[PDB]
């Protein structure tokens, strides 16, 4: 059941909890996410990257979501364009039926970022679609964020607040700038979004490594990081990496333990279950559980 | 573009070629099958087992197919219930939008098989849906097949003609009973269906084995078996095992060559390609290519 992204995030903003934004690239991922939402009674914020959209076809991406909505008509669902890179991409998503689009111009200077973002906002808003943007600079400047939000009229903002991600990659340990987050929150007074905050739960790790996987290069932030960010004003937490690892861990396991197995269901059923549980735990962690 | 099963198979029956009936259990399989049909200009006979329907949900199964039809409006597509086991299952498939249903009561005695098949036919025909049935007994008796088809009004029949399958499994290496096939074809004068005729292409077997797979128990039949079957009057060739081996082979390979890989696209993109190529080759082999 598709609704504006802002309808879900404004509630989270007002009531001070976080909503996991879960990516999907096919049916297996989508089904697991919906079942998680159903079992935890949590609103659903579903994300599709530009790569995922090319992979599925925007018609199949939206099509599958609409089908799942009819299964669980009681669950609020926002279909979100994850990291749109062009106005045309966001435009296509809007026409396709997305209820939320992100335009990422955070790698550009303030003025150009504001220009492109404002352009997307005008288009999306005219079609009743919510918009997300990103802003940094190194950590974001709260007063810059204030002006950016005011002039762009974006619905939610992803501020650079400690994660090594996108145009704000750094060398060393990621650290949540809590006070900076609170300042941004106070000055903007809109839902805030957290990017590049992969948690890699212990059990998920262990499942992947047990299946012969290698995670050297994928180190996650503590659960405390996510909890503190939510207390700081974060209302949307992008979740993809954690889903992939749990999913593929099971795929590797099945391959290892039975060389003669080629029934897709045998691979992807456990994979779905693992992914579903990650989503469920994330919903409880962020506080979106029992919010329906 | 959904058309009734008999529309596609009757053309194959008249012109003496075979149409591959390809199973799918998710998006990846379905997409590869459609791309294959598009690239070989071949009609599409898509199959969904009761297990696949349980896995996907009949709403998603039909839903995805309808979406794919909109992508390739020029390709005739028959959505087929593979090995339905009850009247209710066939009925649910019909109400869901399937354009062809198979009721498998071949493990029952003639009278009971005919009775259930006839009931399914009455229901399906009333809804404009084609029906497939199966008959044996050991090899099928042509005269029995003649009476079965005449009294049941079934659209196409799967005769036990040499393959180890279902209620007609055996120990030795399968041999096509060509003259028996010809007699059944001669007496029934309807499209015939071949079950349990997996023909793993050399490259497919190699790919799966190279990836550390084990195929003990999946020998199958030579291409010539399929070719002679079509010459004999077979118009529908169930294809599932061959698709899954090609698909999983690539999945295993990706898992083997990079332990740090958990991008689902990296796994399933090559998997789709492999499956697509199997379908394309099968279409050319059976002679459905360039028939659109
Ligand atoms: Na985003
Ligand atoms: Na069948
Ligand atoms: Zn970002
Ligand atoms: Zn059969």
Swiss-Prot record, chains A, B:
Recorded metabolic or biological pathway in which this protein acts: Carbohydrate degradation; glycolysis; D-glyceraldehyde 3-phosphate and glycerone phosphate from D-glucose: step 4/4
Keywords: Glycolysis, Lyase, Metal-binding, Zinc
Cofactor(s) needed for function: Zn(2+)
Binding-site residues, dihydroxyacetone phosphate: 166, 196-198, 238-241
Record GO terms (molecular function): fructose-bisphosphate aldolase activity; zinc ion binding
NCBIfam families: cbbA (TIGR00167), fruc_bis_ald (TIGR01859), PRK05835.1 (NF004493)
Quaternary structure note: Homodimer.
Protein name, as recorded: Fructose-bisphosphate aldolase
């Amino acid at each position: 059941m598709l609704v504006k992204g802002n309808e879900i995030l404004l509630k989270a903003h007002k009531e001070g909890y976080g909503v996991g934004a879960f990516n999907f690239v096919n049916f297996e991922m989508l089904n697991a996410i919906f079942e998680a939402g159903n079992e935890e009674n949590s609103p659903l914020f579903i994300q599709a990257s530009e790569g995922a959209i090319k992979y599925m076809g925007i018609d199949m991406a939206v099509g599958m979501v609409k089908i799942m909505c009819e299964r669980y008509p009681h669950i609020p669902v926002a279909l979100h364009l994850d990291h749109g890179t062009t106005f045309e991409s966001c435009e296509k998503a809007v026409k396709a039926g997305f209820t939320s689009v992100m335009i990422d111009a955070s790698h550009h200077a303030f003025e150009e970022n504001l220009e492109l973002t404002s352009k997307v906002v005008k288009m999306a808003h005219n079609a009743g679609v919510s918009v997300e943007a990103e802003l940094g600079r190194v950590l974001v400047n709260p007063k810059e964020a204030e002006q950016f939000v005011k002039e762009s009229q974006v619905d939610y903002l992803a501020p650079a607040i400690g994660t090594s991600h996108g145009a704000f990659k750094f060398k060393g340990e990621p650290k949540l700038d809590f006070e900076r987050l609170q300042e941004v929150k106070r000055l903007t007074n809109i839902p805030l979004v957290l990017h590049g905050a992969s948690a890699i739960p212990d059990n998920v790790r262990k499942s992947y490594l047990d299946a012969g996987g290698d995670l050297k290069g994928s180190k996650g932030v503590p659960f405390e990081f996510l909890q503190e960010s939510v207390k700081g004003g974060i209302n949307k937490v992008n979740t993809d990496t954690d889903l992939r690892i749990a999913f593929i861990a099971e795929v590797r396991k099945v391959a290892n333990e039975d060389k003669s197995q080629f029934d897709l269901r045998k691979f992807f059923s456990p994979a779905q279950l693992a992914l579903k549980n990650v989503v469920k735990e994330r919903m409880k962690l962020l506080g979106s559980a029992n919010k329906i």
